[PDB]
């Protein structure tokens, strides 16, 4: 409740509408009503067009009502959409991920059931390599550009988490 | 008398203003010449390098 | 590229108060142009055509480029500004030498006067007319005060 | 907890050290001239 | 070592009371830009200029720019003294006086 | 970290103890100052009864001015020295804007330390060791001598002090100081018999000493009250910080115990 | 970085030159550069004699690059040399151990691999009894004297570790 969603919506308003390329919003483990709000606001503002092929945003939602597997892979699904737009289209892509922390958290929720010895604060031992495998695809190559805005939740306000 | 002799010393030192102006004119012309030579060199090499890179 | 080395305080003592900013700007541009002549060499490295003869498989484009470059007349800029500052230096030297001759006249007059003061008769052989000749401020204003004592009574 | 203000190295320990050093350098200059 | 033993002592003494103007001079002299590694001779010249008193006549704000100008001057018309410091490794009293007068003249002109 | 929080707790606890003791000491000194302020106020206000009955008005066109500011050598008071300095700076500005040549006097090291960086050309003398011991009439006499044995023949003066109203309230007041020429040239003084310039000189010197004494005795009480309230507020704030940091410390120690347990349990579960 | 090594070298200098009784130095899990420095200081100051073998210090070194077993037993090796000098000759011996904390530390580094549940702060359960069986041999008996100077590393300046 410090303003990550407000800031990312302000950035969508200030950059994505004035953007020339495409845009992908990956809702990861967030409020479903926030996804409904974003959908209908993008329809009102013409950024999503339900009648022809002039839409400029692709939405991928796995929200906080989803089991941990969907919450762990929906970010990858959004990455795949943005990566297609970056590579095969050569476009400049905007990728908004709210919230990316859920990704890690979802992995934690399954890490015990996969039979792994827990790491610090109960997280999976593969936290850093999972995060790296995911994040290294979120990048600008010399085949196309991806500008990425990721909201990152901080558990209990502890930045050393 | 001392004051007048000091005034004469300053008059003797006067010429540095025109030395400065001449220095600046010469140096500006030299900088312009060398920048022009670097521009022509860079454009020629850059086009040849685009060819070699494609 | 023969420059005149310049003292930078002597340059400051000879700048009137209506062009101090101009002197500072000339100084700043002198330092800027020194730095910029330092940060670029004298002659561009003429690249050998080797890496462009044996590594370009195109029909003579490298060769015609090198021909067109070997015979390019790049415009050397002309001074068009040093002659007039030389004329201004001549004019200023004229004015300064005139003023200096005036100052030498004043100095020879002052030296005459100091010899006069140094050759005063001692004050106990001195009349009052001699004092009124030596220090003329010690003369009674017998026009403003015509009657004795020829001065204000409080002055006494 | 004696000397814990200076021991915490906060904004109050730094000013304590500054005060001690100022005072005693003044006193050292006063004691050296009289020697 | 010659310049830096004294610089370390004075910076410690400044940290004790943070004299104070020399300490601020040395602090603002320790600041450095990025991707600009200086040669050891130029470092020695700068720390000399800062530790001998040639920087207390200037306000802490301008110190930085002086340094730049100083370096420029020293790397334009005084390559001999820098080469001397580089080869000998130490400063000699002769070269001490040389750099002394160089920095005095430059501060007079600055 | 638990050790950082414990360090900060110990530091702020020491600060709270010291400020509480200082508040008690300031209360003990303010009791005596407010006791001694009664006869000192009768004295210093009877010294001014003449200029209020004769209605001396000072000169409007005179040139030289002497501005005295009363403070102490001790801080931790609040807006005592700052009030004096603000009044002194305002008055120096308003006088120099009228062409008057102003010279400053600061009783107490704090006012001189505040004003010496911007107003130092306009400065005559300053005085030290004001605040440790209560002011005496010997202090006022010494200040009056060094104001008289200074060769600065002023035309008019003002003295800026902190008049004590209550334990919570003090007001920065200003009193005028007249010269021999102001009280001699006044037409309302023609009714005072057996007067010549010599008795007026002696009277003006003694009244300078009296007004300095009265200002010192008002400012000491104002300052002791201000320091008492300031140390009270410092103790209050220190207690607030102590409570918040005690909450944080208990939180952190619980977290540390839980983390160590989790480490031991995960080490045992891997066997 | 507080001065344990400098202080122990100063004590070596002063006492072990004011001494005539076969000092011993044990380097336990410390820097190799420091060991080379001490060796050459002793060769230079006549305490170690390369030719004309009349030296008066024995050196035992297991440094940081050694596995935990070597760093856990090197203190016992130096202790054993000193014990021979004390008992089998009656001599009065000096023993300089730098740094003895490493001994304990070495044990920890194998504890979990020896099948032992961790104790507090990650130490072996047997920290106290290991330290006791090693330290109770470093002692003056009626047979001879052992003056022991041990450097003890304090992790993070705790002293409650
Ligand atoms: N830019 C803002 N201006 C005013 N209030 C804000 C702003 N950002 C956040 N807030 C307040 O913080 C609340 C939480 O907003 P939100 O962005 O949804 O939290 P979160 O950090 O979990 O995403 C908002 O309802 C609003 O009250
Ligand atoms: N007695 C001393 N005198 C001066 N400096 C010292 C002294 N002891 C230590 N130092 C300084 O502290 C540094 C640490 O030395 P060291 O003995 O290796 O500490 P430790 O072994 O405890 O880590 C030294 O390099 C030195 O700079
Ligand atoms: Mg949110
Ligand atoms: Mg050590």
Print the SS3 string covering F225-249.
Answer: HHHHHHHHHHHHHHHHHHHHHHHHH
Find the CB nearest E69 among C7, C9, C31. C31
Give partners of C (≥3 CB pairs < 8 A). Answer: B, E
Q: Do A117 and F270 touch (CB under 8 A)?
A: yes
Structure tokens given for C57: 């498989």
CA trace torsion A112, A116, A119, A125 (10° rounding): -110
Cα G13 to the center of its chain, rounded Å: 17
Which of G2, G3, G151 is the best mutation target for the ligand 2 pocket, counting ligand atoms within 8 Å of the beta carbon and taking the most? G3
C-alpha to C-alpha distance for A125 and A129, rounded to whole angstroms: 9
Closest ligand 2 atom to G1 CA = 23
Q: How near does any CA of chain E get to the CA of C143, in Å?
A: 58
The β-bridge partners of G26 are G60, G97
Q: Decide: residue F164, CB within 10 A, 0-12 exposed, 13-18 middle, 19+ buried.
A: buried
Q: Do F13 and D8 touch (CB under 8 A)?
A: no
The answer to whether the beta carbons of residues F109 and F126 sit under 8 Å apart is yes
C-alpha to C-alpha distance for F136 and B54, rounded to whole angstroms: 97
Q: Which residues fall within 8 angstroms of residue G15, CB to CB, at 6 or more apart?
A: G94, G147, G149
Q: Any chain D CB within 8 A of the CB of F14?
A: yes
Q: Which of G111, G131, G130 is nearest to G121 (CA)?
A: G111
DSSP state for residue A13 in the 8-state scheme = I
Q: Which residues of A are catalytic?
A: 4, 30-31
Q: Which of C11, C96, C12, C97 is nearest to B22 (CA)?
A: C11
Neighbours of ion ligand 3 (CB under 5 A): A 5
Q: Do C35 and E109 touch (CB under 8 A)?
A: no
Resolution of this deposited model, Å: 2.5
Q: Which of F10, F110, F79, F28 is nearest to F233 (CA)?
A: F79
Which of A4, A5, A6, A7 is the best mutation target for the ligand 1 pocket, counting ligand atoms within 8 Å of the beta carbon and taking the most? A6
Strand G92-98 to G145-150 pairing = parallel
The β-bridge partners of F101 are F64
Structure tokens given for E97: 């006086």
Q: Take atom 8 of ligand 1 and give the residue whose Cα is closest.
A: A3
Terminal Cα distance for chain C, rounded: 75
Structure tokens given for F20: 């509480």
Q: Which residues fall within 8 angstroms of residue B5, CB to CB, at 6 or more apart?
A: C107
Collect all residues from F whose CB is shorter than 8 A from any CB in A: 262, 266, 269-270
Provide the CB-side half-sphere exposure for E18 (13 A, CA).
14
Q: Which residues fall within 8 angstroms of residue E53, CB to CB, at 6 or more apart?
A: E22
Q: Any chain F CB within 8 A of the CB of G119?
A: yes
- SS3 at position G26: strand
The answer to whether A6 is annotated as binding is yes
DSSP C28-84: HHHHHHHHHHHTS-SS-----SHHHHSS--SSSHHHHHHHHHHT----PPP-SSHHH
- SS3 at position A62: strand
For tokens 């320790």, the residue is E30
The answer to whether the beta carbons of residues F122 and F104 sit under 8 Å apart is yes
Q: Which residues of chain C have a CB within 8 Å of the CB of B25?
A: 79, 81-82, 85
Strand F170-178 to F156-164 pairing = antiparallel
Q: Which residues fall within 8 angstroms of residue C29, CB to CB, at 6 or more apart?
A: B24, B28
The answer to whether the beta carbons of residues A137 and A79 sit under 8 Å apart is yes
Element (H, E) at B25: helix B16-53
Preferred mutation among C6, C70, C95 to probe B, highest tally of B CBs within 10 A: C6
SS3 labels along chain F: CHHHHHHHHHHHHHHHHHHHHHHHHHHHHHHHHHHHHHHHHHHHHHCCHHHHHCCCCCCCCCCEEEEEEECCCCCCCCCHHHHHHHHHHHHHHHHHCCCCEEEEEEECHHHHHHHCCCCCCCCCEEECCCCCCCCCHHHHHHHHHHHHCCCCCCCEEEEEEEEECCCCCEEEEEEEEECHHHHHCCHHHHHCCCCCHHHHHHHHHHHHHHHHHHHHHHHHHHHHHHHHHHHHHHHHHHHHHHHHHHHHHHHHHHHHHHHHHHHHHHHHHCC
The answer to whether the beta carbons of residues A138 and A131 sit under 8 Å apart is no
Task: Provide φ and ψ at A146, rounded to 5°.
Answer: -130, 115
Give partners of D (≥3 CB pairs < 8 A). Answer: E, F
The answer to whether the beta carbons of residues A34 and A27 sit under 8 Å apart is yes
Q: Do F270 and G112 touch (CB under 8 A)?
A: yes
Q: Do D1 and F7 touch (CB under 8 A)?
A: no
Structure tokens given for A154: 């901080």
Ligand 2 centroid from CA G38, angstroms: 15
For tokens 């006249």, the residue is C105
Q: Which of F19, F36, F252, F57 is nearest to F133 (CA)?
A: F36
The answer to whether the beta carbons of residues A104 and A130 sit under 8 Å apart is yes
Count the Cβ atoms, other than its own, within 10 Å of residue G42: 21
Strand G57-62 to G23-28 pairing = parallel
CA trace torsion F67, F71, F73, F75 (10° rounding): -130
Element (H, E) at C107: helix C82-118
The answer to whether the beta carbons of residues E16 and D21 sit under 8 Å apart is yes
Chains G and F are in contact, defined as 3 or more C-beta pairs closer than 8 angstroms: yes
- SS3 at position G144: coil
DSSP state for residue C11 in the 8-state scheme = H
Terminal Cα distance for chain D, rounded: 39
List, in sequence order, the alpha helices (H) in chain G. 4-17, 32-44, 68-87, 101-111, 127-135
Structure tokens given for F47: 């010294």
DSSP A64-97: TTS-HHHHHHHHHHHHHHHHHHHHTS--EEEEEE
C-alpha to C-alpha distance for G5 and G150, rounded to whole angstroms: 10
C-alpha to C-alpha distance for A43 and F28, rounded to whole angstroms: 75
Q: Which residues fall within 8 angstroms of residue F218, CB to CB, at 6 or more apart?
A: F37, F41, F70, F161, F162, F163, F164, F173
């Amino acid at each position: 409740g410090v303003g990550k969603t407000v800031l990312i919506m302000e950035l969508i308003n200030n950059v994505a509408k004035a953007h020339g390329g495409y845009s992908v919003f990956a809702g990861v483990g967030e409020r479903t009503r926030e996804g409904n709000d974003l959908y209908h606001e993008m329809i009102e503002s013409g950024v999503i067009n339900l009648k022809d092929a002039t839409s400029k945003v692709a939405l991928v939602y796995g929200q906080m009502n989803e089991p941990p597997g969907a919450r762990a892979r929906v970010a990858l699904t959004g990455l795949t959409v943005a990566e297609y737009f970056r590579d095969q289209e050569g476009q400049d892509v905007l990728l908004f991920i709210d919230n990316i922390f859920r990704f890690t958290q979802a992995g934690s929720e399954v890490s015990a059931l996969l039979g792994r010895i827990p790491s610090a604060v109960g997280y999976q031992p593969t936290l850093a390599t999972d995060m790296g495998t995911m994040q290294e695809r979120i990048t600008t190559t010399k085949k196309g550009s991806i500008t990425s805005v990721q909201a990152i939740y901080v558990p209990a306000d502890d930045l050393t988490d | 008398i001392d004051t007048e002799k000091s005034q004469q010393a300053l008059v003797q030192k006067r010429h540095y203003l025109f030395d400065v102006q001449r220095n600046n004119i010469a140096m500006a012309l030299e900088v312009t010449y060398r920048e022009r030579l670097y521009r022509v060199y860079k454009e020629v090499k850059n086009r040849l390098d685009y060819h070699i890179s494609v | 590229l023969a420059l005149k080395t310049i003292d930078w305080v002597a340059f400051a003592e000879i700048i009137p108060q209506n062009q101090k900013a101009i002197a500072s700007s000339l100084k700043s541009w002198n330092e800027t142009l020194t730095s910029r002549l330092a940060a670029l060499p004298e002659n561009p490295p003429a690249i050998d055509w080797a890496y462009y003869k044996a590594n370009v498989a195109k029909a003579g484009l490298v060769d015609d480029f090198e021909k067109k470059f070997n015979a390019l007349k790049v415009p050397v800029p002309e001074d068009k500004y040093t002659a007039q500052v030389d004329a201004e230096e001549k004019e200023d030297v004229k004015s300064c030498a005139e003023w200096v001759s005036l100052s030498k006249a004043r100095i020879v007059e002052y030296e005459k006067e100091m010899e006069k003061m140094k050759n005063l008769i001692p004050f106990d052989q001195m009349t009052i007319e001699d004092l009124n000749e030596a220090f003329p401020e010690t003369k009674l204003d017998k026009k403003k005060y015509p009657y004795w004592p020829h001065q204000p009574i409080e002055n006494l | 907890g004696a000397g814990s203000i200076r021991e915490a190295g906060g904004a109050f320990g730094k000013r304590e050290q500054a005060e001690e050093e100022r005072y005693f350098r003044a006193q050292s200059r006063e004691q050296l001239a009289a020697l | 070592k010659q310049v830096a033993g004294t610089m370390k002592l004075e910076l410690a003494q400044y940290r004790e009371v943070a004299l104070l103007s020399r300490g601020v001079r040395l602090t603002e002299l320790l600041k450095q830009g990025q991707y600009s590694p200086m040669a050891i001779e130029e470092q020695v010249a700068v720390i000399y200029a800062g530790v001998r008193g040639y920087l207390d006549k200037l306000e802490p704000s301008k110190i930085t720019k002086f340094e730049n100008a100083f370096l420029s001057h020293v790397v334009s018309q005084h390559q001999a003294l820098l080469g001397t410091i580089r080869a000998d490794g130490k400063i000699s009293e002769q070269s001490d006086a040389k750099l002394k007068e160089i920095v005095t003249n430059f501060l007079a002109g600055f | 970290t638990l050790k950082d929080i414990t360090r900060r707790l110990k530091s702020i606890k020491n600060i709270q103890k010291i400020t509480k003791s200082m508040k008690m000491v300031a209360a003990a000194k303010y009791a005596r100052a407010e006791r001694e302020l009664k006869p000192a106020r009768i004295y210093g206000l009877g010294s001014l009864a003449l200029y209020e009955k004769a209605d001396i008005k000072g000169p409007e066109d005179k040139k030289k001015h002497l501005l005295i500011g009363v403070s102490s050598d001790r801080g931790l008071c609040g807006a005592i020295h700052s009030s004096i300095a603000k009044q002194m700076k305002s008055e120096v500005a308003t006088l120099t804007a009228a062409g008057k040549e102003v010279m400053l006097v600061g009783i107490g090291d704090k006012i001189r330390g505040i004003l010496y960086r911007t107003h130092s050309d306009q400065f005559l003398v300053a005085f030290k060791e004001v605040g440790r011991k209560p002011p005496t009439f010997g202090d006022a006499s010494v200040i009056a001598l060094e104001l008289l044995n200074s060769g600065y023949e002023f035309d008019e003066g003002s003295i800026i002090f902190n008049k004590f109203r209550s334990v919570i309230s003090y007001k920065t007041e200003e009193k005028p100081i007249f010269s021999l020429n102001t009280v001699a040239s006044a037409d309302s003084m023609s009714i005072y018999d057996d007067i010549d310039a010599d008795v007026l000189q002696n009277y003006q010197e003694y009244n300078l000493a009296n007004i300095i004494y009265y200002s010192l005795k008002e400012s000491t009480t104002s300052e002791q009250s201000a320091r008492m309230t300031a140390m009270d507020n410092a103790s209050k704030n220190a207690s607030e910080m102590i409570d918040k940091l005690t909450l944080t410390f208990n939180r952190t120690r619980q977290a540390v115990i839980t983390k160590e347990l989790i480490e031991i349990i995960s080490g045992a579960a891997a066997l």
